[PDB]
Amino acid sequence: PQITLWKRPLVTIKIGGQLKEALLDTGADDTVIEEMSLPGRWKPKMIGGIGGFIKVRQYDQIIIEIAGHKAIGTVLVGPTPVNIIGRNLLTQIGATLNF
Amino acid sequence: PQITLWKRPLVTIKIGGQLKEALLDTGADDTVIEEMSLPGRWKPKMIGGIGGFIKVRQYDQIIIEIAGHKAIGTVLVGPTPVNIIGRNLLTQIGATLNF
Ligand SMILES: CC(C)[C@H](NC(=O)COc1ccccc1)C(=O)N[C@@H](Cc1ccccc1)[C@@H](O)[C@H]1O[C@@H]1Cc1ccccc1
Numbered sequence: 791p792q793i794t795l796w797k798r799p800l801v802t803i804k805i806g807g808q809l810k811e812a813l814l815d816t817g818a819d820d821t822v823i824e825e826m827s828l829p830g831r832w833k834p835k836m837i838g839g840i841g842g843f844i845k846v847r848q849y850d851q852i853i854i855e856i857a858g859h860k861a862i863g864t865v866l867v868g869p870t871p872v873n874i875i876g877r878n879l880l881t882q883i884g885a886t887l888n889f
Numbered sequence: 890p891q892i893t894l895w896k897r898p899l900v901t902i903k904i905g906g907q908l909k910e911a912l913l914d915t916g917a918d919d920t921v922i923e924e925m926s927l928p929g930r931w932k933p934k935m936i937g938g939i940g941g942f943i944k945v946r947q948y949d950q951i952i953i954e955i956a957g958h959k960a961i962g963t964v965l966v967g968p969t970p971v972n973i974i975g976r977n978l979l980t981q982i983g984a985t986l987n988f
Contacts, residue, residue, distance in 0.1 A: 791987070791988065792985050792986070792987045793985060793986040793987070794980070794985055795915060795976040795979045795980050795984060795985065795986070796976075796980055798918070798976075799915050799986055813915075813916050814915055814916075814986055815914070815915055815916030816894060816898050816912075816913055816914060816915045816916070816986070817898075817912050817913070817914025817915065817916045817917055817973055818916055819897070822939070837939065838939070838940055838970065839938040839939030839940050839970070840921065840936065840937070840938025840939065840940065840941075840943055840969055840970065841937060841938045841939060841940030841941030841942055841943060842940035842941050843940050844939060844940050857988075859988065870939060871937075871939070874916060874939075877894040877895070877897070880894045880988075881893070881894045881895055883988050884988050885894060885986055885987065885988040886891050886892055886893050886894065886986070886987050886988070887891070887892040887894075887898055887913055887915070887984055887985075887986060887987075888890075888891050888892070888984065888985055888986075888987055889890070889956075889958065889979075889982050889983045889984040889985070
C-alpha cells in the first residue's frame with residue numbers, strides 16, 4: 791500500500807493478542823508502544839526525543855503485525871503519547887519513503 | 890528517489906542559504922530545525938514530542954530545499970536534538986510511504 795502524509799500515517803497493528811493503532815514513523819529508530827502487559831523478560835531502557843527522555847521496558851523478539859505484514863523484533867513499552875512503529879520494524883515490512 | 894530505512898533517512902537541506910542535514914520524519918506533524926539565524930519574521934510557539942514540550946520560534950512561509958526539492962512553509966526553530974522534516978513539508982515534496 792501507499793500511504794500519503796496529509797494526515798498522521800496511522801495503521802492497525804496486532805501485538806500481544808491486541809489490536810491497536812500506531813504511527814508509521816521514519817524518524818524513530820525504535821518502536822514504542824503504549825503501556826501493555828506483555829509477557830516475559832525485559833530490560834529497562836530510556837529513549838529520547840523532543841522534550842527529553844522517558845523510561846520504557848525493552849522486550850525482544852516480539853511478534854507484531856503491522857497493516858497485515860508480520861514482523862518480529864524489539865518493542866519498547868512505556869508512557870508514550872502515541873504508538874510508534876520505528877525503523878527497526880519498518881525495514882522488516884519493506885517500507886520506503888518515495889518522492 | 891526511493892529511500893529505504895536501514896539507516897536514518899538523513900538528507901541535505903538548504904535553508905536561509907545554508908546547507909544542513911535533516912531527518913525525513915513521517916512521525917512529525919511539523920518541521921523543527923536547530924537554533925540558527927534565519928531571515929523572516931517569527932512568533933513564539935510550543936511543540937511536543939516523545940519526552941515533553943519545548944519552546945520554538947515559528948517562521949511561516951520559509952523557502953527550503955529538501956534533497957533538491959523545493960518547499961515553502963512553516964519551519965520551527967529551537968533546541969531539537971535532530972533537524973526534522975515533518976509532514977507539513979514532506980507533503981509539499983510529494984513524499985509517500987510505500988510497502
Ligand atoms: C520515538 C523515539 C524512539 C524517537 N527518537 C529517536 O529515534 C532517536 O532519538 C534521539 C534523541 C536524542 C538525540 C538523538 C536521537 C523520536 O522521538 N523520534 C521523533 C524524531 C526525532 C526527534 C528528536 C531526535 C531524534 C528524532 C519523531 O519521529 C517522533 O516524535 C514523533 C512521534 C510522536 C508523535 C506524536 C507525539 C509524540 C511523538
